[model samples]
Target: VPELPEDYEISEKTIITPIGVLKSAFENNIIIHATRVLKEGSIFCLEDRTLIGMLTEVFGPLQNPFYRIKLPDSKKNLFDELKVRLGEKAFIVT
Candidate 1:
């Protein structure tokens, strides 16, 4: 809904719990298409694998929209990936 801060740098952090290792799953393109949407972009593009792997790795491949999740990377990557992918060419951005 608003212009994103260009100054932000991509960073990764690991969160351990009942869930396990959280690596940075996406390249920049993954951030483009998911700015405010849910699994929309991730469900149907080149970037799905990255986000899906992260979500599945943390939750499971059976991605129900109703599933409850609170991990930071999971939330951040799913949408951040979308934002970074929206306008630019995918491979070039990736």
Candidate 2:
């Protein structure tokens, strides 16, 4: 494997949903690693969560890529930010 950060050692657990396979990444945005590429980051409008961000960064390869989500820069902790914004909804990081 390429040199990953200390945090990368741990494999991020993502979820396969009836809606779609979305890997939660930094902030509230999740990484949608699919065969086809999205020209640009689209909206993730689900029953509970509706996110707005870009494709994190351009250029695509590998089975699952990263997506930089657009989340409000908060003073609160990560958990608190998600909880406050997402409510009962759950998420992950990769």
Candidate 3:
């Protein structure tokens, strides 16, 4: 696990969805799917609550939304990390 900032906190109530399956990692976007409706710009994280990316686009059906998570410039270094974790679980940080 990576060390988070001193003030970083993971709250159960802030978790919008429990399952954000990593679908794909594009040049500047990470694709994921979830059953919950999340607003644009909402942050997403790994199951361990490791902050990863932000929602840039949302498509697909309302019952199951597909999201385009923009990779922040700061997290560009994790592009490969994200790609390797495809099909892994994630969480929406509300």
Candidate 4:
């Protein structure tokens, strides 16, 4: 896979709730498309797992409403519906 230039930096930030925040936080950490989190190429889900932090939608379509968690961190996986906008931020939003 192609990577960004070394001059730039990429950092990850995540939020974990007492619930299923682990998976959601993981997705929010990575997943970006056209410069937005949880974009078309910014999410993916399998029969039994959600590949957090993977831009799998780039390879194919992602699962809508990816998971059943209901936290801002998890909803970060739904940029459009949740009305969220973000960049390669080093700080945690959710």
TM-score winner: 3
Give me candidate 4's TM-score against the actual structure. 0.18
Off by over 4 Å in 3: 1-16
| Alpha-carbon lDDT of model 4 | 0.28
Tens digits of per-residue lDDT for model 4, 1-94: 2222323222233332111122223433433332114332222322122223333333223532223222234345443322232222221122
Q: Give the count of colliding residue pairs in each prediction.
A: 16, 1, 0, 0
Report how far residue 76 has shifted in candidate 1, in Å: 1.8
Summed over model 4, clashes come to: 0
Looking at model 3, the pairs that clash are none
lDDT per model vs. reference = 0.29, 0.35, 0.71, 0.28
Task: Determine which window of 10 residues in candidate 2 has minimal summed lDDT.
Answer: 1-10
Candidate 4 residue pairs in clash (backbone atoms < 3 Å): none
Of models 2 and 3, which has the larger TM-score? 3
Q: Is candidate 2 or candidate 4 better by lDDT?
A: 2
Candidate 2 collision pairs: 56-68
Give a tens-digit lDDT track for model 1, residues 1-94. Answer: 1122334322224221221222222432222112113341122223222332222212334442222222344356555654444443221111
**Worst ten-residue run, lDDT, model 3?**
1-10
